[PDB]
């Protein structure tokens, strides 16, 4: 299942703008509802729950799928908040966002889900594909001369492309150099509170 | 019975029982006759009914009626009754 609801409503509760730029946010940066402007009680469980909610609705990942990401983030060496954002970033719909082939996160999910992309010449239609090192992310030969794909051509300059992937020319195909460590990950969220949420 | 081969085998398990029982009873009435001559202290028939009792045991062991380690255990016991008389 997907959320399929209002997107500003879960950017107002978390007090943090989740999608890239929003005018409905910053007119009302307080949580929604009829009791929207009230003084909230700053608990410790609230700081740990809402920080996990920043990570789910930024990426569009349900709870029984986000929990399995934690079950292998704590089990790999290194840290836990590092490798949690590493395996969340390598989802293929998040690759289409960072490569500048989509406007928001919810259309980068459809363009993978409706089957507009290959990887190694293999037709994928799952958003939760985890790209490894040296993967090419190619677009289908049929899906050129298409309206949402030609709008991603001239608009390849307004958002920064991270250093862990590379976009090339007239073939809009994405080359994955390595899995990103920390620095080229965009930060609306702190990472140690998601690790402390599941410790309860 | 119910299976076609099982009626076949019931008829052959009884042919084999009547065959083997006649051979085992011939061994018991030939070891016993040695025990008469050995208990009387004869040494005349006991030296030559041993040679016909052990020969009946080896023929019963080649016909599958008794096992070969059973024939060896009965020939060793009758021969050690001869050497002590």
């Amino acid at each position: 299942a997907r959320y399929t609801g209002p997107v500003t409503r879960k950017s107002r509760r978390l007090r943090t703008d989740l999608v890239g730029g929003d005018q409905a946010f910053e007119k009302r940066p307080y949580p929604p509802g009829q009791h929207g402007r009230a003084r909230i009680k700053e608990s410790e469980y609230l700081l740990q729950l809402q920080e996990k909610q920043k990570a789910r609705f930024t990426y569009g990942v349900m709870e029984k799928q986000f929990r399995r990401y934690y079950e292998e983030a704590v089990r790999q060496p290194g840290k836990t908040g590092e490798e949690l954002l590493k395996i969340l970033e390598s989802r293929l719909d998040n690759v289409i966002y960072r490569a500048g082939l989509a406007r928001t996160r919810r259309m980068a999910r459809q363009l993978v889900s409706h089957g507009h992309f290959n990887v190694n010449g293999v037709h994928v239609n799952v958003p939760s594909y985890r790209v490894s090192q040296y993967d090419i992310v190619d677009v289908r030969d049929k899906s050129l001369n298409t309206v949402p794909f030609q709008i991603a051509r001239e608009t390849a300059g307004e958002r920064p492309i991270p250093s862990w992937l590379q976009v090339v020319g007239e073939r809009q195909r994405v080359l994955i150099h390595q899995l990103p460590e920390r620095a080229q990950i965009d930060v609306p969220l702190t990472e140690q509170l998601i690790v402390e949420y599941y410790s309860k | 019975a119910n299976i076609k081969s099982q009626q076949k085998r019931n008829r052959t398990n009884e042919r084999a029982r009547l065959r083997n029982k006649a051979v085992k009873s011939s061994l018991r009435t030939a070891v016993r006759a040695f025990r008469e001559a050995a208990h009387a202290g004869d040494k005349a028939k006991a030296a030559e009914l041993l040679a016909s009792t052990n020969r009946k045991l080896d023929k019963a062991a080649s016909k599958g009626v008794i096992h070969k380690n059973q024939a060896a255990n009965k020939k060793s016991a009758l021969a050690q009754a001869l050497n002590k008389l």
Binding site: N120, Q133, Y134, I136, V168, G169, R173, L175 | -
Partner: protein, 113 residues
């Protein structure tokens, strides 16, 4: 007596197999006496490995192979070097060596520059 047989231990639509030495009075996935190989009949040629110094031990001592394992020991050549046939070299063939994952990535960087 002693057989050399296969053991189905894959998924539902992926019948993996192992070449295993077992008694005839045993179910398929029972205790093998010794596992000596494997057979994956889903790749484009096949994926066949026989240990070839343990398959010579069990054939010399009396293990009767079953009829689909007999076709495998003729292919790898372990049957011909036991009965003394002139097909003693292995006539098995491996899959086509694909260009590796690093090679395609360097081919794509040079394709743009």
């Amino acid at each position: 007596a002693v057989k050399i047989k296969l053991t189905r231990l894959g998924k539902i639509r992926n019948p993996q197999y192992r070449v295993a030495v077992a008694d005839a009075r045993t179910r398929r996935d029972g205790r093998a006496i010794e596992v000596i190989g494997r057979y994956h009949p889903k790749e484009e040629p096949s994926l066949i490995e026989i240990n070839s110094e343990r398959a010579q031990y069990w054939l010399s001592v009396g293990a009767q192979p079953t009829e689909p394992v007999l076709k495998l020991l003729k292919i790898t050549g372990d049957w011909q070097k036991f009965k003394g046939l002139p097909g003693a070299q292995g006539r098995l063939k491996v899959a086509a060596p694909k260009p590796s994952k690093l090679e395609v990535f360097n081919a794509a960087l040079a394709a743009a520059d």
